Amino acid sequence: WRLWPSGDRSQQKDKQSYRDLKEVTPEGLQMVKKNFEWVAERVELLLKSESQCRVVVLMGSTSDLGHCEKIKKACGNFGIPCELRVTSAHKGPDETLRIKAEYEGDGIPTVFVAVAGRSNGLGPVMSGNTAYPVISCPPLTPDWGVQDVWSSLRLPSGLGCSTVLSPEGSAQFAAQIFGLSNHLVWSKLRASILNTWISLKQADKKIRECNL
Amino acid sequence: LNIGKKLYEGKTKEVYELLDSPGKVLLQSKDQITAGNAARKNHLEGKAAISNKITSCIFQLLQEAGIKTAFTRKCGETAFIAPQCEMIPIEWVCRRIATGSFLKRNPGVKEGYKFYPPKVELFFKDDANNDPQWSEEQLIAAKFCFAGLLIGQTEVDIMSHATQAIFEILEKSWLPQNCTLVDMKIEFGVDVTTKEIVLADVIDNDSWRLWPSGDRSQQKDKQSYRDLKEVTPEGLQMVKKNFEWVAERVELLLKSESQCRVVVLMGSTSDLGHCEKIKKACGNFGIPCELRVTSAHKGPDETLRIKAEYEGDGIPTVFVAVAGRSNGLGPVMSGNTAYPVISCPPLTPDWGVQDVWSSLRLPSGLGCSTVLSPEGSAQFAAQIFGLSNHLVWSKLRASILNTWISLKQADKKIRECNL
Amino acid sequence: LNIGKKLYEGKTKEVYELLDSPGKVLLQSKDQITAGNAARKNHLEGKAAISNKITSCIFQLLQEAGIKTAFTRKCGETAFIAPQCEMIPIEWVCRRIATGSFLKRNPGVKEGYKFYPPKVELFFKDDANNDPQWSEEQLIAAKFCFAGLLIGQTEVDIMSHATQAIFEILEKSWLPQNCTLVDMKIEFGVDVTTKEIVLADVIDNDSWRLWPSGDRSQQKDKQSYRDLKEVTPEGLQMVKKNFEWVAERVELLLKSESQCRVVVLMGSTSDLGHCEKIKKACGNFGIPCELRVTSAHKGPDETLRIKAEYEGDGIPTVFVAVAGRSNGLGPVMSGNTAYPVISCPPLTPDWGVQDVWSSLRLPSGLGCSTVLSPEGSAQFAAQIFGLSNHLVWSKLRASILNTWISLKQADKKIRECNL
Ligand SMILES: Nc1c(C(=O)N[C@@H](CC(=O)O)C(=O)O)ncn1[C@@H]1O[C@H](COP(=O)(O)O)[C@@H](O)[C@H]1O
Ligand SMILES: Nc1c(C(=O)O)ncn1[C@@H]1O[C@H](COP(=O)(O)O)[C@@H](O)[C@H]1O
Ligand SMILES: Nc1c(C(=O)O)ncn1[C@@H]1O[C@H](COP(=O)(O)O)[C@@H](O)[C@H]1O
Ligand SMILES: Nc1c(C(=O)O)ncn1[C@@H]1O[C@H](COP(=O)(O)O)[C@@H](O)[C@H]1O
């Protein structure tokens, strides 16, 4: 590769320092060795997380737990710790705000996922009372889903609350948010674009055989 | 081949039983041409082979379109094998252009009057009385029974509709040879095994009027012979060349004049079964159909590369986009090709009311259509190719007839449970 | 015709000012053939007229498709009038089939490799260094300015896309002559008045490779001259025959190979405005379009009679059914014709969500499609006719290009508010 500290070519740390010597002297080889050592002293830091990430899934009822386990598992695929909590905006709004505050208060950057079926008040109340992002991921079913979703979507002014229906999608959206400030999350999202694209190529190659 | 006794004997053909093949017969053409209930006749060498060649090409054409027809296979230069039928003694005439007897029975109508839709008439077979015209009322009142089928309103209606469809198919088929099919006569029979009414007898150069470039003076059919003041041995050689002209070209009606292809693009292998139904249905119309897997959302670069492979090889193509949920595949394809794109989304009642709108409400500059039925997708694609391909057109036209016959048959069945 | 000063002088043509016409010039072809940057050069009588005829037919073809082109009209046997442009000194090559310099610069690739989509390359015009290939990066870095237009990323992207579209249209247009367009070179200019990049210079038998029946040994283009070991006057006569062969056929690219017609059927005269939009939109694709009034529900006998008039006259037809509320018109038409039927219901936000399902959920055996946009329904009908008509196809292809260019131009404008 070519590696420029501060994007400055004259600070090149790669083998180009050796390619560019008019004449190889043992003084020239010592500079090239220092450049290699400089890269070697820093490369292990690419494996280090520069930012903490956390998703908190808030569920209005334990009957939605299975939907919440899918989000949590999906967060694991992106290396993002994910906590489940039970709170109802309608039956325990005092407790919703207390739980919110525990996660707001410990310094760890957090995305909230609100999982509430029927009339989702949980995402709205959370969205209105935190500066952190909130994603509604309602556990919609074809029975009443067409009716229930509008409670997540049409909110009063001053509410940033987003909606992602896929539970794996809600984790992926939360990963995309953390990927702006965490290169390890970003890299899993980028590789995942590649791998999915490769899977399509491989599936099209297979099905293309039935056309001969 | 094991020949048995002669069953029917006419002035141009003979029918024999086949002891080897139960319920099949051999129709042997003869080297004879006739005009006016055998009051004019002539030996003509090669006429048997010309007649048999034309009816064999035409019956294969009609049969492969889906018309129910008394034809098994050709059997040498001068015969063909058919299912045994009891002939219905009616001449069914269909006209696009008024000429001949239509002018004599309708003084004041001028040669060239066009019939939309094609005009159907019935004539009772009777040499003695010069084949008098019958009304449908007369034929129903005859209470004819053949192979046990009573010929009533339903059967008369079926022969009338089938006569029009057969004419249309032959008319469309001759067009690419620059020949106007003016009119024709056909006969139906009842298959002694299936009891179904089927096109029978023969269709040859005595069966129709065929004008190259729609010009009457370039007549290629038997009218060339009927019209002759005097039958000279020089006149009979001209009539012979006309029959040979038809005989050369008739085999070209079986030639596809244009290549056709459907490409079904699916965003996921989970939609494969829906895509198989489209492909099967394309097979019913004789249209090659390829399946490919590409996602406009996860691999749009590849959607365009696949599009380009099918745009680029010269084969006329219809794309069918099969994408569930938010269909982006039809839109992206529609926006990037001059070829037609059909969205056929695999809708289910769970979310289909919501999903359909992604196919329907498109930005300007998009001609993308929507067909919900997978079999319908293929049918729509056939209809587009039928504008440029007479074989596809003909399967669609015969299918209109056969569907309509099925309704008549189902109504006749259920009408019994009302007694 | 008041000629002025000689503005530019090339190896095979001269450009003159027109004192009578501000912003127009005359391109005069010469009786000269050349190849390479040594002494392969020859007088060839009739070449000026052949060159001028071909570029005049081709530019008319591309201009009438909607490709923006420096062409006003033919002006005698050997010249044509054009809007004045500042030429961009790039040779834009497009290839369907790898031959020629593509094989030299890519050793290992074999004669006949197919490009999907067609491959675009750039060569800088400079005879001194034999026209070296440039990257898009090199062209952008050159910061060329012509008639005040800086040639940046947007302009390079537009000439690249247009090169491919122009190739595709010429390729499709030669197909009905059984000729394979293998590759071509074109040049663009900036129109000094409009400031638009337009196809310019000429397109003639020096501009492309044309293989009858896709056979290289039958090459009809200037390659026949490039390939001579030695120029003899017997060699020059063969090359002249090849040029004449192209010139004798090029006018046929302007000929329609198929008739096209849309029939818009409306259940009520209150939908007429919606129907006028479809008809106008059909005009943009050069497709005649007829309006008729018929109701499936109040006059189904008449619906079928009208259908039959259009089925019966031999002209390939697409039906558009325009019926508000419960659309029975598309369904009844779809069920009774082998031709395609498109429902384009005049939906409004009052009841449109309810009314559309009458077009969409049809009994089995119905191919009927739905297109909500009235301009869309014409575009869909054009896409169907484009499978069998190169002139319609070419307008659809150019329209993809022009719409894409409009987006590029609108993004370039809005990008300024971000500085
Ligand atoms: N118009 C020209 C030119 C061209 O300008 N040639 C002159 C030479 C010169 O003027 O420098 C000549 O030799 O004819 N060279 C190729 N092409 C066309 O471009 C596509 C690419 O051809 P390749 O790059 O493979 O030679 C094919 O269609 C050629 O006919
Ligand atoms: N549904 C709610 C809630 C809530 O549920 O707390 N607060 C305001 N609203 C309603 O949203 C609309 C927009 O109001 P604002 O955007 O001005 O808050 C109003 O009709 C309001 O009653
Ligand atoms: N093949 C026969 C016979 C016959 O069997 O004598 N009579 C008429 N036709 C054909 O029927 C159409 C109508 O003929 P008319 O106009 O004489 O009724 C024509 O195509 C004719 O060849
Ligand atoms: N709507 C689209 C698109 C697209 O528009 O690009 N790609 C796939 N799909 C559809 O989404 C469903 C989920 O499929 P996957 O989750 O396996 O991609 C399928 O029915 C597919 O056709």
Ligand SMILES: Nc1c(C(=O)O)ncn1[C@@H]1O[C@H](COP(=O)(O)O)[C@@H](O)[C@H]1O
């Ligand atoms: N709506 C209509 C019409 C019509 O309107 O003519 N014909 C059949 N159908 C209905 O479509 C469904 C599919 O029926 P088929 O696909 O077997 O025709 C049935 O419930 C039928 O009554």
